[PDB]
Structures are given as C-alpha cells and as structure tokens.
Design a protein around this nucleic acid. Structure first.
Ligand SMILES: [K+]
Ligand SMILES: [Mg+2]
Ligand SMILES: [Mg+2]
Ligand SMILES: [Mg+2]
Ligand SMILES: [Mg+2]
Ligand SMILES: [Mg+2]
Ligand SMILES: [Mg+2]
Ligand SMILES: [Mg+2]
Ligand SMILES: [Mg+2]
Ligand SMILES: [Zn+2]
Lengths: 86, 74, 73, 53, 84, 98, 83, 58, 77
RNA sequence: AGGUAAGUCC
RNA sequence: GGACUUACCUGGCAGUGAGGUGCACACACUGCAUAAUUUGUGGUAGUG
C-alpha cells in the first residue's frame, strides 16, 4: 500500500513486547516495552543497558526520551501486517 | 502561540554576542523578531586572531545565538 | 524579478541539479519532485564525495534536513 | 492558552506574557504569596512537636 | 492546559540567585531578573565561569533557552504550591 | 495550515507524486532499499511501511558499516526493525541492474 | 501519563546527553520532559589518559535543579522517596 | 516571589556556588571526526538481482 | 526598530552581495546576491560562491538555494 | 470568558 | 470578603460530551495546525 498517517501508533501497540533499542549515542537497551508514547518516548522493564564500550548493567525500569532513539529491533515473529492496519 | 523575546531593554545598546561556532561578535542592537533573529549595527567580527573587523547592519539567525552581554547600561 | 525558493525549485524540477549535503557529500541528478519541507527526489543520481565523482546510484530520496544548498546543472 | 495561578486558586482563561505579568503584579496576588510563605513559617511551629520531646 | 509545572518553577525563581549551565559548558551565576516561557533568561551581576575555569564579571546578560542545559534554583522553591 | 480543513489527504497526494513516492513505490513493489543513516551505517532492506518523517518499518535488513589499522567491513542482519526518520540522510531504490 | 507519575517523588537517575548523571528527587515534569530534581547530585566518569588506570567518579552537589528536556536521554529509578 | 519582607525573602537564598569541573565533551565545532559520514556508492553491489526479488503484494 | 526580515528585503533590493556565515561549519562561508527568500530564511543566491577559510580560494556555484537551517549570520559585500 | 486597575453598593 | 460599573491586557481551528434546532461563550476529553530557528523527527552521530 503506502505510508501510514502516523507510525508511532504502531510502536504504541508494542506493549509487553521485548525489543532492543539503539540510541543515537551508541547505548543499546534490551527490554520489555511497558509503554511507548506519541513522542516516541519509551518505557521498558527488565532492562539490560549497555552504554558504548561499557559492561552491561541491569535495571528494573528505564524510560528513554524518544528523540534519542535511532532504532527498535523487533521480535522476529512480530506480526507486522496485523499490527500495521492502523 | 510563540511569544516575542524581551529585548526591548537592549535596544540601541552595544552588545557582545556569543555565537554558534565559537564565534563572538559585538555591536548595537537595532532589532529583533520572535525567533530571536537580531539586527546588529556597526558590528565587529572579533576573530580568534584577536583581530577585529567591521561588517555593519548584519542579520543574526536566532538559532545560533547563545548568550548576549550588554556592554553599555540597559 | 524577486525569485523565491519554491518557484526556484519548481523551475529546476525536470532539470539536472546538484544538491550538497551538510555532511559534505553531493548528489547530482534530475530533480523530480519537491515538497513543502523541501525533501528532494532525484533520478539518474550520482554521488560526488569531496568534489569528485564517487559512483552512480539511481532513484534517490534526500531527507530535507540533510541539505545545505541545491543548484542547477 | 489557559493558565492556573497556584497562589490565587484562579485561572487566566487566555494566557499571554502581558496578561500573566499584569496578574502577577496585582494586589490580590502579592498578598496571597506573602500569606503562602508566612503559612510556611507556621510550619516551624510544627517543629515544637519535636521541642516538647 | 499549555503552561507546565517546571517552567512555572522557573518563573518563581525570578528575582533570586540562579546558576545556569549553557550548552557550551559555560556557567552563569547571578540574579535572575526575568525568564520567558521558553527558557530565555535575562540575568544581572553574573559570575561567568568559562570552560577552562577562569571567571569573569558581567553586568547584564540574556541567554537563549534553547541553549541551556539546566538551571539551579533556590531550594525554597521546592516548597512552592505547584510542586504539591 | 494552508489546508486547515480536516482531511488533508494532500498528505496522500504528495505521497503518490511528491518525493516520498520513493517509499510509496518501494513499499508497493517490495523493492529493496539502501539507506545511509546518521550513525553512519548502511541499511539495505525492504520497506513495510513509512510516514512523513521517513520513519520506516523494515524487514530483512542488512546493516553495513566500517571499522578499524586498515579499514575493516562489518555487517549484521536484522529481520525486523523500526527506524526513526530523523536518522535518515538518503534512501536509494534498487537500480534493477540484473 | 501515569508511566511518569509512577515514579514521581522517587529518587531518579537521569543520564544527560553529555554523559553526566543527575540523581535527584523527582518533583515534576512536562510535555518536554523538562525535569525538576530536588537535592540533585551530579556524577560523572572521568577517563584515565593513560590506557589503564582506575576511572574517577566525581560527585558535585547542585540542589534544586531544572533540567531542560532536550538534554535528557534516559531515566531509571535509583531509590524510593526519602522520609 | 521577588518583593517580600526581608524576614521571609531570606529563605530564597542561593546555595554556595558550585565547584568548577572541566567539560566532558569537546565543543562540537572543534571535535575531530575520525571516520566522517560517507556515501553509499560502494554498496550498490549489495542489492539483490531483480529477478530474485519477491513479487509486488498489491 | 528594524525587523530582520526587512533588512533582508533591503539586501534583496540593493542587489548587495551578501556573505553568509554557516551554522556549525566554521571553515566554509558562502557569498552571493539575494534574488529571493522565504519564511524559513531559505535564500536564493544569484552568483553564489563557496569561500574556504583555510584555502583562501573560491568555488563558483551559480544560482543556489541555501536552506535556512545553516545560516548563522548575514554580512555585506 | 478571565484577569487587572479605578469607582459604586453589600 | 461578595455584587455590579467602566477602562486596559488577552483570545488558533475541528469532533464529541450536549438529548428541539441554530448561534455565542466557558469547561472536559480527543484530534489537527505541529517534521521549518526555543524542547515532541537530529550538527549530542556510536567515529575509542
Ligand atoms: K504533532
Ligand atoms: Mg533537539
Ligand atoms: Mg446525545
Ligand atoms: Mg517544530
Ligand atoms: Mg526539527
Ligand atoms: Mg511551521
Ligand atoms: Mg531543529
Ligand atoms: Mg522540533
Ligand atoms: Mg530538532
Ligand atoms: Zn495569582
């Protein structure tokens, strides 16, 4: 088809999905999304944050201001066509 | 939605302006807008060499202004 | 003749153009389309790194934020 | 566009720089402020509960 | 709606001493004369502290909000009505 | 806006004719795309969807980049991503070389 | 917004874009994620210029801090509200 | 809170000025870019053969 | 008071040759005659040049549109 | 609609 | 404290709540304007 109106609307559906986020500063976050927000601000639980060239660190919770996100790496099974009907 | 900045206080005053690229400039503030774009007059470049140069009646984009300092009383 | 940016581009649409990016690369090709944000679609596009030709690409979208200037032929 | 004065418990249905400054250099306002922080010094009275022990 | 709690808190500190770190890493300490809704700040009697550690005195300054990292406001402000 | 009326599918018209047609077509025809990204990494993949900012959902991506001594090539495979649009520089539709 | 209100009054560790950490009592926020932090302490990691020496953590007290949203990266919870 | 009895206004007192610390990062215009942004020309060979492409779903 | 938009309009009319300082690029500047512009501060520059500070030699461009995001400062001659 | 200021009454 | 009077400063658009219809103004929620200089679509690139 074509472009969605907004595509955050998709990310907002990914509650309870476990993802890996890369930040614009090289930090990698692996965690389970508790919520995503219109401004792409993103909340995770059960997080393993790995700042650039540092040893991982585990955290119960983390929120990331969305502008900092470069990308989400999604679950291989995540049913895209389903979730994209928007 | 977007209000103008309060630079009436600094109108027609000599200013010294810290700018984006480690660039500094100085001169008399003749006007402004809600983006904080400025009009400077009798403006001097203040190059890193320590050498100063005269360009006058410049426009400065608000975007690239960090801080300005009043040299004359406000 | 006060020749403003939207008309200027609309002018160049169709014509070969060269777009220089803030990051120092430039892309040469037939400007196809432009939008209100000045994103650019190019065709028969080729990549010039540091002034001299790097390679031939194809149909290219350039996100507007990346552009420094755009110019004819 | 709306603004809520925590000190006055009142609204400025249409906020502006000009309007908010006018309100804030207002008779009612300045008194409410004075009152708020005087009431806070009364807090120090709650210190006496410690004073008694 | 539109106005928000942390900017209110900034305006509440108008008139008092604030420290303010800019994007450049300079730090300005002085009397906050006034603040706008964007964080653009006019200040007086400022001890600037340059990146190197040297300080200077400045009479009147004005700082673009978009170029501020953070401000240090007076601790009393935590007892302001909004923060409750 | 210039279009303050509440059905700005001028959004769609632009998508079909404007420069984001690069994507609209890539999505429709399932063509591979190569994106030069502001982490300075190269992403080659398919576009499942996109939006105004060039937020893209991608499939079967191969992320490609260069590290160091002499410069070494690197690649990783990512089967489903969402890329944030701001981090796009340039997108390039697959020139059907054969 | 309850994702954020959840943590209000907790002590929160914020990572800033330059790699500073602000730890502070999380009093307020807004649509930008401007923050108000109380009793806020700043920490930072200082690299040894020689290839292997112990790295310095440097604390510095700030007190009541207003952090501009743009410079915020992430927040996680450091500790529960003080008593 | 500017204009109050000096009794109360003494509450809004600054804390002592903060220790200097040098900056963490260089200034952006003076930072040295060891592998600056670069183009995609070398990568075209990566693209699939169009015969081996999957068909247009619609 | 002189609005910055007006003095750009003044520069246009005068057919003055304007030099632009760039945002976050301190080595290059660009100069040319302002044939036109817009709300975003994008400039159409009739006989644009690329001036490189280290080189002290110029690269000729022709007629260019320079996107506004880049501009730091506008100068004369 | 709301704030402010000045006035009139309660 | 409360009521009215006058002057001054301010005021984005739409859908729903809202049930005779329409208009005006307020409140609540939801959108849009909003990816174009001051935060929510990058000169903080991850470059050791
Ligand atoms: K929006
Ligand atoms: Mg930003
Ligand atoms: Mg009904
Ligand atoms: Mg914007
Ligand atoms: Mg932007
Ligand atoms: Mg706009
Ligand atoms: Mg911007
Ligand atoms: Mg923006
Ligand atoms: Mg931005
Ligand atoms: Zn009030």
């Amino acid at each position: 088809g074509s472009g969605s109106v907004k595509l955050v609307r998709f990310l907002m559906k990914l509650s309870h999905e476990t993802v890996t986020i890369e930040l614009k500063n090289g930090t990698q976050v692996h965690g389970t999304i508790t919520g995503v927000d219109v401004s792409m601000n993103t909340h995770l639980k059960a997080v393993k944050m790995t700042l650039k060239n540092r040893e991982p660190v585990q955290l119960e919770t983390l929120s990331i201001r969305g502008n900092n996100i470069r990308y989400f790496i999604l679950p291989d099974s995540l049913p895209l066509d389903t979730l994209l009907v928007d | 939605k977007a209000h103008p900045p309060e630079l009436k206080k600094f109108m027609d005053k000599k200013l010294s302006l810290k700018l984006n690229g480690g660039r500094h400039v100085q001169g008399i503030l003749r006007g402004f807008d809600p983006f904080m774009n400025l009009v400077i007059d009798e403006c001097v470049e203040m190059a890193t060499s320590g050498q100063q140069n005269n360009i006058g009646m410049v426009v400065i984009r608000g975007n690239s202004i960090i801080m300005l300092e009043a040299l004359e009383r406000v | 003749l006060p020749l403003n940016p939207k008309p200027f581009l609309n002018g160049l649409t169709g014509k070969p153009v060269m777009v220089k990016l803030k990051w120092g690369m430039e892309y040469k090709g037939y400007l196809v389309s432009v939008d209100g944000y000045m994103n650019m679609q190019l065709a028969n596009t080729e990549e010039y790194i540091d002034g001299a030709l790097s390679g031939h690409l194809g149909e290219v979208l350039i996100r507007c934020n990346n552009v420094l200037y755009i110019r004819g032929v | 566009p709306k603004f809520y004065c925590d000190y006055c418990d009142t609204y400025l249905t249409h906020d502006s720089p000009s309007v908010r400054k006018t309100h804030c250099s207002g008779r009612k306002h300045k008194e409410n402020v004075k009152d708020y922080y005087q009431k806070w010094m009364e807090e120090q009275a709650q210190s006496l509960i410690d004073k008694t022990t | 709606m539109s106005i928000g709690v942390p900017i209110k808190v900034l305006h509440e500190a108008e008139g008092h001493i604030v420290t303010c770190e800019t994007n450049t890493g300079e730090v300005y300490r002085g009397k906050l004369i006034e603040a706008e809704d964007n964080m653009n700040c006019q200040m007086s009697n400022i001890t600037v502290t340059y990146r190197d550690g040297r300080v200077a005195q400045l009479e009147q300054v004005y700082i673009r909000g978009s170029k501020i990292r953070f401000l240090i406001l007076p601790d009393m402000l935590k007892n302001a009505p909004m923060l409750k | 806006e210039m279009t303050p009326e509440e059905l700005q599918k001028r959004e769609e018209e632009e998508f079909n004719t404007g420069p984001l047609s690069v994507l609209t077509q890539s999505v429709k025809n399932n063509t591979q795309v190569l994106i030069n990204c502001r982490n300075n990494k190269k992403l080659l993949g398919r576009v499942k969807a996109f939006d105004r900012h060039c937020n893209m959902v991608l499939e079967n991506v191969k992320e490609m980049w260069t590290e160091v001594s002499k410069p070494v090539n690197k690649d990783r495979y990512i089967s489903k991503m969402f890329l944030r649009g701001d981090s796009v520089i340039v997108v390039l539709r697959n020139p059907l070389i054969a | 917004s309850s994702k954020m209100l959840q943590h209000i009054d907790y002590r929160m560790r914020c990572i800033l874009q330059d790699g500073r950490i602000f730890i502070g009592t999380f009093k307020a926020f807004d649509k930008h994620m401007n923050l108000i932090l109380c009793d806020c302490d700043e920490f930072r990691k200082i690299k040894p210029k020689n290839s292997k020496q112990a790295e310095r953590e440097e604390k510095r007290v700030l007190g009541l801090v207003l952090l501009r949203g743009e410079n915020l990266v992430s927040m996680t919870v450091e500790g529960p509200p003080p008593k | 809170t500017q204009f109050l009895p000096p009794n109360l206004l003494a509450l809004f007192a600054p804390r002592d000025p903060i220790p200097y610390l040098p900056p963490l990062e260089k200034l952006p215009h003076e930072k040295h870019h060891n592998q600056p942004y670069c183009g995609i020309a070398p990568y075209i060979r990566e693209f699939e053969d169009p015969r081996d492409a999957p068909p247009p779903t619609r | 008071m002189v609005q910055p938009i007006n003095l750009i309009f003044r520069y246009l009319q005068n057919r003055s040759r304007i030099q632009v300082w760039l945002y976050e690029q301190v080595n290059m500047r660009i100069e040319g005659c302002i044939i036109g512009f817009d709300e975003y501060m994008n400039l159409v520059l009739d006989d644009a040049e690329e001036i490189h500070s280290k080189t002290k030699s110029r690269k000729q461009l022709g007629r260019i549109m320079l996107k506004g995001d880049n501009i730091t400062l506008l100068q004369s001659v």
